[PDB]
Amino acid sequence: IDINTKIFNSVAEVFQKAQGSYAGHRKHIAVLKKIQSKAVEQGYEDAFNFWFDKLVTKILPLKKNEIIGDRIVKLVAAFIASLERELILAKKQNYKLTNDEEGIFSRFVDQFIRHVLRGVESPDKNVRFRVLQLLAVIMDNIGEIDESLFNLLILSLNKRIYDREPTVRIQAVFCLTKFQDEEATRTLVASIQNDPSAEVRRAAMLNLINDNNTRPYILERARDVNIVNRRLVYSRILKSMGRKCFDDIEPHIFDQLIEWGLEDRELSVRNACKRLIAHDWLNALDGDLIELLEKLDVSRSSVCVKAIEALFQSRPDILSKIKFPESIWKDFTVEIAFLFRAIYLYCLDNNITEMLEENFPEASKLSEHLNHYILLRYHHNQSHFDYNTLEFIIEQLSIAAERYDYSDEVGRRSMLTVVRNMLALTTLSEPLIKIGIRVMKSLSINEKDFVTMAIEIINDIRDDDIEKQESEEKEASSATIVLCLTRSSYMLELVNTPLTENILIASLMDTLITPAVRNTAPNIRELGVKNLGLCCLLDVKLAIDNMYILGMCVSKGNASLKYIALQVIVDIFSVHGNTVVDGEGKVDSISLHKIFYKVLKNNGLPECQVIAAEGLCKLFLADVFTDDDLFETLVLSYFSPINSSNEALVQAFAFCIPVYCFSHPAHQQRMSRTAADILLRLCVLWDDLQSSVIPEVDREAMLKPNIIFQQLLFWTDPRNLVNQTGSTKKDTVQLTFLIDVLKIYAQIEKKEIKKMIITNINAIFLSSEQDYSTLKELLEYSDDIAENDNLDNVSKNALDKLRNNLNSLIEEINERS
Amino acid sequence: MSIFEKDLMAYFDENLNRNWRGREHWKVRNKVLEIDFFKTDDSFEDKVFASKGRTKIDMPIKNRKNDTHYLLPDDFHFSTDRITRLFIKPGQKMSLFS
DNA sequence: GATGTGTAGCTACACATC
DNA sequence: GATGTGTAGCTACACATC
User: Fold this and answer.
1) Distance from the first to the final alpha carbon of chain A
2) Which of residues 48-77 of B touch A (CB under 8 A)?
3) For C11, which residue's CA is nearest its C1'?
4) How far apart are CA B45 and CA A442, in angstroms?
């Protein structure tokens, strides 16, 4: 036998048994190094390389997950690493080997890479996949390489990153993730943003360098459209950072991250974020709940309420460890003050009886601690930081005080004095004004009482300024007008009885409300309307006399003013309904509807569209509004391309429209009647959008008429009714709609649009329980177009299918009784 | 009014949780045993290294970039709760579905 | 594009072993 | 305690095939 032939027999023997299982791979590595060592002494070095390569080539055409290929891949990867290991630890302390070991390794790896690369651009997916796969698992162990071979690697990879297959695109990053130390990063930052394969982004996400420069793009995936890709940044990336989040992340992004995960739509992402906070971050800070709160900027963050609760549920044991001795109330900080709020409200909601008895001071005693901070804030002189610190503490304690057990008469009267003297303060910031009224509300146990006290705080603040104006002009300064109304709003937000019961408001109204409505300042005008809207919900006649002025404010008012005005009108209708329109001395509803249109149509102010959108849906749900033309104007604003840019408006309709139809048959019926003309108007819009040639063209800013059609089949489908009386199986709501669509089919011009409809007409639901005459009508219109028009073979088939389903249905009817 | 309004309200939240995006997302949404390393068929080897020819093995430049970055749009959490509450008087709520 | 089927990445519980 | 082990199921997501 020949030396060369003997080598092949030896190496081929290795792969034959290595493909069978992972059993004797340790041996095979030792054998291969032996075969190589035997060949180099006989001079046949290049013979070993040749047969090794040719034997690896046998597995490239194998699919992904083909169990055999993986085995060999792992074997080839182990053999290279094994050859480098011997080289590394040797270079460590052992003097250089006389047997030219590095050279053999350098020459073998270079030669091998160039071989596997010969199929880097093969027409076959599997070939290209397994070429990159081999390079990925062997990339770390290559060591030194020639420059030309280095340039050829980055080149072949930079072109494969944009390969057609995702599978091969993945492996393309792995090979790049190694060239990352700081062009490689540049590419991965581009793939993590623009690659349409979630798994290629994920690969570029987890394996990116995580440098100060690349950290933003990585965290960006927190809102990746893929469920997994979002769960990972919490479970994988933030864990890997441990405590580095609090040091090497800007808090403004930090707060945003925790806000998303907690409020995400997928249960799997919330937990993954919850578990990060409770388990990982608490163990990372040695169980110091305060330090954890020091990180989560408690003063500014709006999620501390969400984060803490998930923790209390994840660790009910630490719950009992809290500490609140009388000795403190000296070092009270935003963290401790907030802790007090977080704990106390949590015990009440979950009803932790043992704690509420002694873990919290009495009402009378809490008032002593609360007031203490009020005097220290307002009565006597990093100053602004201190001022904020006190306000936050005052707020937290106040929130806890709002839900106390006030059976204790001494504590109530004590607290009541603290808030009354606080609310009476002129420089009390709005956050504390709000809760103050909320507290004083919980102390009255009598609506009239709560009002009498509040009104007094207002009129006193009013008269104080007026009486000070007596120098040498019988009205309070502008600033005072703001304070009185700010308090009047929250106080009114809590009253739930007519104005006839409480006369003090009618005075207050003529005192400062209506003079504010007529004021020359925006903010005061906005406030006056808010308070006016709160009073209208109590007395109907007050609303009827104010319908005109309100509608006027909307029409001619600026963005801000028109914003608040339109809301009031919605609520007035919510409670009273149509008792405030269409009648003697009452405004005609037609005028208001025209005012809804102009806002809904208005695109210069998006936020106002949302209210007009949200507000009208609510009114249609309440069955107070019943105007087909208006309801039709709603759905148009959903699909319209002009409103596509208003992200808020789309989600508003996407949730209200489906529920509206499925709620009540009469609601769905209203869709069915006006569901045909809408499709027509939209077809025309898509036709004018696609055909028109303009620089500002976003032809993709609208659903194609085929999708829009399916949508209208969805809502009109009676099977989606929630009541399901059992007598709804015969509901002809969807048929009558399709009939109306067929009657319009003659009015569309483009063939493409016509097909877009016909291909989707069979989504309807047909039943033998439905009305016989209605199916016959639907058959004749389908029969009318089945032949009298020219059809694409696809359109005819679907249409013919429908007809025969009709005919097959009439067969199920008549033959009866 | 809360009794049954509560459940129907709870019905639509859980059912329409993933359709919040609206728009196109309205749709509910939703071998070889062994190799013989001894045989020689090396002309098969030339098959592997074949040039691309008319096979594309690449991604259209249209698909290589996307402006949305495949991110998720801002979420306004339009749930049954946000609908029942009034606008200027969030505490009180109206009893639609009645 | 509509399918059916496979796959990735969990997620949970019962457990041992030290 | 923690650390493994095995087993089970789940769901959004790929690819397969026509």
Assistant:
1) 95
2) 48-53, 55-59, 63-66, 69-77
3) A268
4) 85
Which of B87, B93, B95, B97 is the best mutation test for A, with the most CBs of A within 10 A? B87
Q: In chain B, which residues have their Cβ closer than 8 Å to the Cβ of A537?
A: 89
The CA–CA distances, whole Å, from A570 to A516, A552, A563, A782, B85 equal: 21, 15, 12, 44, 12
Structure tokens belonging to residue A687: 């036709």
Task: Calculate the CA A183 to chain-centre distance.
Answer: 33
A281 domain residue, yes or no: no
Pull the structure tokens for residue A346.
Answer: 């949590």
Among A141, A27, A32, A21, residue whose Cα is nearest residue A70: A21
**Token pair in block for residue B81:** 């709760």
Provide the number of structural domains found in chain A: 1
Taking the CA of residue A207 and the C1' sugar atom of nucleotide D9, their distance in angstroms comes to: 30
Question: Do A424 and A457 touch, CB atoms closer than 8 A?
Answer: yes
Contact B74 A68 (CB under 8 A): no
Method of structure determination: X-ray
Report the C-alpha gap between A593 and A620 in whole angstroms: 13
Name the H helices within A93-178.
101-117, 125-138, 147-160, 166-178
Specify if A533 maps to a domain. Answer: no
Q: Which runs of consecutive H residues, i.e. helices, occur in A640-704?
A: 647-663, 665-691
Q: How far is A98 from chain B (nearest CA, A)?
A: 34
**Distant-in-sequence, close-in-space partners of A391: CB < 8 Å, separation ≥ 6:** A377, A429, A431, A432
CA-CA-CA-CA dihedral for A497, A502, A504, A507, to nearest 10: 80
Three-class SS string for A452-486? HHHHHHHHHHHHHHHHHCCCCCCCCCHHHHHHHHH
Does the nearest atom of strand C lie within 7 Å of A609's Cβ? Answer: no
Kindly report the number of other CB atoms within 10 A of residue A212's CB atom.
Answer: 8
Peptide bond into A814 cis (omega under 30): no
CA distance A378 to A596: 46
Q: In Å, what resolution does this model reach?
A: 3.2
Q: What Cα–Cα distance (Å) separates residue A670 from each residue in A595, A738, A771?
A: 22, 14, 19
Minimal-distance CA residue of chain B relative to A641: B23
Q: State how far the Cα of A661 lies from the Cα of A656, in Å rounded to an integer.
A: 9
Strand partners of residue A583: A586
Strand D contacted by B29 CB (< 7 A): yes
HSE, CB side, 13 Å, CA atoms: give it for residue B72: 23
Cα B48 to chain centroid, rounded: 37
As a whole number of angstroms, the distance between CA A575 and CA A204 comes to 54
The DSSP letter of residue A229 is H
CB contact at 8 A, A620 and A667: yes
For the beta carbon of residue B29, count every other beta carbon within 10 angstroms: 9
* A5 occurs within a structural domain: yes
C strand bases under 7 Å from protein CB:
3, 7-11
A506 touches A452 (CB < 8 A): no
Residue at token pair 């008269």:
A463
From the list A519, A506, A512, A510, the residue with the least C-alpha distance to A484 is A512
B78: nearest CB among A63, A163, A652: A652
Preferred mutation among A127, A607, A651 to probe B, highest tally of B CBs within 10 A:
A651
Q: Is the Cβ atom of A101 within 7 Å of strand C at any atom? A: no
Domain holding A54, by residue range, is 1-145
Residue A31 lies in a domain: yes
DSSP-derived secondary structure for chain B: -HHHHHHHHHHHHHHTSTTTT-GGGGS---------SSS--THHHHHHT---TT---S--TTTT--TTTTB--------HHHHHB-SS-SSSB--TT-
